[PDB]
Short mmCIF file of C-alpha atoms in Angstrom, two decimals:
data_model
loop_
_atom_site.label_atom_id
_atom_site.label_comp_id
_atom_site.label_asym_id
_atom_site.label_seq_id
_atom_site.Cartn_x
_atom_site.Cartn_y
_atom_site.Cartn_z
CA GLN A 1 82.55 112.46 147.70
CA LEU A 2 85.57 113.58 145.70
CA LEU A 3 87.70 115.32 148.35
CA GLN A 4 88.62 114.74 151.96
CA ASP A 5 86.14 115.75 154.63
CA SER A 6 87.95 119.00 155.53
CA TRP A 7 87.55 120.23 151.96
CA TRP A 8 84.45 118.42 151.12
CA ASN A 9 82.58 120.18 154.20
CA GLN A 10 83.41 123.43 152.39
CA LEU A 11 82.90 122.62 148.78
CA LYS A 12 80.28 119.88 148.52
CA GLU A 13 77.64 122.53 147.49
CA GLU A 14 79.63 123.70 144.46
CA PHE A 15 80.00 120.17 143.21
CA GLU A 16 76.14 119.89 143.17
CA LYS A 17 75.70 123.06 140.99
CA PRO A 18 74.55 122.94 137.22
CA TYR A 19 77.94 124.48 136.14
CA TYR A 20 79.87 121.66 137.78
CA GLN A 21 77.70 118.93 136.26
CA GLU A 22 78.23 120.64 132.79
CA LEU A 23 82.06 120.71 133.42
CA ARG A 24 81.94 117.03 134.55
CA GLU A 25 80.20 115.94 131.40
CA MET A 26 82.63 118.02 129.22
CA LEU A 27 85.71 116.26 130.82
CA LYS A 28 84.25 112.84 130.60
CA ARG A 29 84.09 113.40 126.90
CA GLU A 30 87.53 115.00 126.57
CA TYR A 31 89.43 112.48 128.55
CA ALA A 32 87.81 109.65 126.39
CA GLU A 33 88.47 111.59 123.14
CA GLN A 34 91.78 113.32 123.39
CA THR A 35 94.77 113.90 125.74
CA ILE A 36 93.90 115.79 128.83
CA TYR A 37 96.41 116.85 131.60
CA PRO A 38 96.96 116.17 134.45
CA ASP A 39 95.72 112.52 134.66
CA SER A 40 91.95 112.48 135.75
CA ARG A 41 92.82 110.99 139.20
CA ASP A 42 95.30 113.87 139.79
CA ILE A 43 93.03 116.73 139.04
CA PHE A 44 92.40 117.67 142.71
CA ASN A 45 95.94 116.72 144.02
CA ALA A 46 96.61 120.13 145.51
CA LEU A 47 93.58 119.62 147.93
CA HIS A 48 94.44 115.90 148.49
CA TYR A 49 97.95 116.74 149.76
CA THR A 50 96.98 119.84 151.70
CA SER A 51 93.76 119.68 153.63
CA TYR A 52 91.65 122.80 154.38
CA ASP A 53 92.80 122.66 158.12
CA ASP A 54 96.46 122.16 157.18
CA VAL A 55 96.77 125.15 154.61
CA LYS A 56 99.49 127.58 155.76
CA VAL A 57 100.46 129.20 152.38
CA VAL A 58 98.60 129.35 149.00
CA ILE A 59 100.66 129.67 145.84
CA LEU A 60 98.38 130.37 142.88
CA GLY A 61 99.02 129.25 139.42
CA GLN A 62 97.31 129.41 136.14
CA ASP A 63 96.52 126.23 134.22
CA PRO A 64 98.27 122.82 134.24
CA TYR A 65 101.45 122.20 132.24
CA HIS A 66 100.37 120.91 128.75
CA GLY A 67 103.16 118.62 127.88
CA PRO A 68 103.54 114.85 128.48
CA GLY A 69 104.62 113.78 131.97
CA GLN A 70 104.62 117.27 133.54
CA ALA A 71 101.54 118.05 135.49
CA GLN A 72 100.72 116.49 138.73
CA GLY A 73 97.52 118.48 139.70
CA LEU A 74 99.78 120.97 141.46
CA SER A 75 100.69 124.64 140.63
CA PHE A 76 104.30 125.06 139.27
CA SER A 77 105.44 121.53 140.18
CA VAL A 78 106.48 118.78 137.82
CA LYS A 79 106.95 115.10 138.16
CA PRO A 80 110.37 113.38 138.72
CA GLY A 81 112.23 112.50 135.61
CA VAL A 82 111.12 115.59 133.91
CA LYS A 83 113.03 118.93 133.31
CA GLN A 84 112.20 122.02 135.12
CA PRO A 85 109.84 124.66 133.56
CA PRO A 86 111.57 128.08 133.36
CA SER A 87 109.04 129.35 135.85
CA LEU A 88 109.95 126.57 138.14
CA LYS A 89 113.69 127.04 137.51
CA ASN A 90 113.35 130.66 138.39
CA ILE A 91 111.57 129.87 141.54
CA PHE A 92 114.43 127.66 142.55
CA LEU A 93 116.95 130.51 141.82
CA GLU A 94 115.03 133.03 144.01
CA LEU A 95 114.68 130.29 146.65
CA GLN A 96 118.54 129.89 146.50
CA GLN A 97 119.11 133.64 146.96
CA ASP A 98 116.39 133.96 149.66
CA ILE A 99 116.98 130.85 151.77
CA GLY A 100 120.20 129.44 150.44
CA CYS A 101 118.74 126.03 149.20
CA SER A 102 120.48 124.36 146.44
CA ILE A 103 118.60 123.77 143.32
CA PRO A 104 117.13 120.21 143.26
CA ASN A 105 117.68 117.59 140.44
CA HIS A 106 113.88 117.29 139.96
CA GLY A 107 111.10 119.83 139.94
CA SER A 108 108.55 118.13 142.17
CA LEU A 109 107.09 120.39 145.04
CA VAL A 110 105.15 117.53 146.79
CA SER A 111 107.35 118.27 149.89
CA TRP A 112 105.89 121.72 150.12
CA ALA A 113 102.35 120.42 149.75
CA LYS A 114 102.93 118.03 152.59
CA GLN A 115 103.95 120.90 154.78
CA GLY A 116 100.72 122.93 154.14
CA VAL A 117 101.56 124.81 150.99
CA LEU A 118 98.49 124.63 148.73
CA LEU A 119 99.67 124.51 145.16
CA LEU A 120 96.43 125.62 143.46
CA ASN A 121 96.04 126.31 139.84
CA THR A 122 92.90 128.45 139.02
CA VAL A 123 92.19 126.13 136.00
CA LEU A 124 92.60 122.34 136.75
CA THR A 125 92.81 120.79 133.18
CA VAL A 126 94.29 121.41 129.83
CA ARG A 127 94.27 119.83 126.43
CA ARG A 128 97.84 118.67 125.39
CA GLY A 129 99.81 121.30 123.61
CA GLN A 130 97.24 123.99 123.94
CA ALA A 131 97.70 126.53 126.55
CA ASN A 132 94.44 127.90 128.29
CA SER A 133 92.31 125.45 126.16
CA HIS A 134 90.02 124.75 129.12
CA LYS A 135 89.75 128.51 130.12
CA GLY A 136 86.18 129.66 130.84
CA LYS A 137 84.70 126.13 131.04
CA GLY A 138 83.90 126.40 134.81
CA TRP A 139 87.14 125.80 136.81
CA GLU A 140 87.51 129.43 137.54
CA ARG A 141 84.29 129.59 139.23
CA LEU A 142 85.16 126.51 141.52
CA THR A 143 88.69 127.84 142.33
CA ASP A 144 87.29 131.26 143.23
CA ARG A 145 85.19 129.29 145.68
CA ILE A 146 88.24 127.56 147.07
CA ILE A 147 89.80 131.11 147.81
CA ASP A 148 86.41 132.29 149.31
CA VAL A 149 86.45 129.29 151.80
CA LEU A 150 90.08 129.94 152.65
CA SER A 151 89.33 133.70 153.19
CA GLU A 152 86.56 132.67 155.50
CA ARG A 153 88.87 130.50 157.62
CA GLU A 154 89.52 131.67 161.03
CA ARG A 155 93.20 130.82 161.07
CA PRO A 156 95.18 133.13 158.95
CA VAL A 157 96.47 131.98 155.49
CA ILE A 158 99.37 133.49 153.60
CA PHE A 159 98.68 134.07 150.00
CA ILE A 160 101.53 134.29 147.40
CA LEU A 161 100.21 136.02 144.39
CA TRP A 162 102.74 136.00 141.44
CA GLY A 163 101.63 138.01 138.39
CA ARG A 164 98.62 140.04 137.39
CA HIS A 165 95.94 137.25 137.29
CA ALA A 166 96.78 136.06 140.70
CA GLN A 167 96.78 139.58 142.03
CA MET A 168 93.23 140.08 140.75
CA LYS A 169 92.22 137.63 143.55
CA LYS A 170 93.08 140.06 146.25
CA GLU A 171 89.52 141.38 146.15
CA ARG A 172 88.28 138.00 147.40
CA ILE A 173 90.45 137.96 150.36
CA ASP A 174 89.95 139.27 153.68
CA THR A 175 93.24 141.16 154.44
CA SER A 176 92.19 142.02 158.04
CA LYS A 177 93.18 138.40 158.79
CA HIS A 178 95.24 137.12 155.97
CA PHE A 179 98.71 138.07 154.58
CA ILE A 180 99.60 138.85 150.96
CA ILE A 181 102.94 138.49 149.31
CA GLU A 182 102.69 139.65 145.75
CA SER A 183 105.27 140.26 142.87
CA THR A 184 105.68 140.10 139.24
CA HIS A 185 105.55 136.52 137.81
CA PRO A 186 108.60 134.23 137.95
CA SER A 187 108.29 133.44 134.23
CA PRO A 188 111.31 134.39 132.25
CA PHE A 189 108.85 136.95 130.84
CA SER A 190 108.14 138.86 133.99
CA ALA A 191 110.72 137.56 136.44
CA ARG A 192 113.38 140.35 136.33
CA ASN A 193 110.63 142.87 136.99
CA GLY A 194 109.74 142.09 140.42
CA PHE A 195 110.04 138.48 141.45
CA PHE A 196 113.80 138.43 141.91
CA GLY A 197 114.70 139.86 145.30
CA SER A 198 111.22 139.67 146.63
CA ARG A 199 112.15 136.94 149.12
CA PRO A 200 108.72 135.27 149.31
CA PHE A 201 109.81 132.32 151.34
CA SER A 202 111.73 134.19 153.96
CA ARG A 203 108.76 136.42 154.20
CA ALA A 204 106.21 133.73 154.54
CA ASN A 205 108.14 132.01 157.34
CA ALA A 206 108.17 135.26 159.20
CA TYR A 207 104.42 135.39 159.05
CA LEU A 208 104.37 131.94 160.56
CA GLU A 209 107.06 133.01 163.12
CA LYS A 210 104.54 135.68 164.11
CA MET A 211 101.45 133.42 164.55
CA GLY A 212 103.29 130.80 166.56
CA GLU A 213 103.42 128.28 163.68
CA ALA A 214 106.17 126.07 162.39
CA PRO A 215 107.97 127.30 159.34
CA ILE A 216 108.21 125.60 155.96
CA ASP A 217 111.37 123.73 155.15
CA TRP A 218 111.38 125.24 151.73
CA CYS A 219 114.38 123.25 150.58
CA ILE A 220 113.91 120.17 148.47
CA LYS A 221 116.23 117.28 148.72
CA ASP A 222 117.63 115.55 145.63
CA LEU A 223 116.26 112.11 144.55
#
């Protein structure tokens, strides 16, 4: 059993499939033979922090950060002591305009995860220094499944879909129940084209205000 019961009751069948066994053998080799991020114990951290029952918001990312000391097994987040990726910085600038929060002196989003924000990357491992190096090795099939089981959940989920790849997931989601907040990506590449001004945090809390749920405290506090 790799995950807590709330997730494992939904996903155990995926872990038994040939594609996962192949992925698991491939990762055993790569963790032994070269530098893979995040640390192997951290691969599923998004799901460890936020249980299936606790999920309120899903923020989809691509693959893990590929530099030393960055990834934590969470989309967008970095560990403490590390500088903020430009996508994260930009996220904090929009948060500041939207909610008012000051920018933190670290880029760890663990507080969001603890409040029900699922920080899911669609690919869960990467070789150091090599973007998208574990693309197409099986992760995308598993994370599509994670989206499927969230779509099937009775209680409504708010999906934040930044950029074109995340928006492709809309087809998997049942929009008669769930809420979609989508924009261009926060990356300095795509940010000024639809992320800034979109007010994604204010808009999620509103979707929570509406379902009788507690809002997220989207502000992080300094170390």
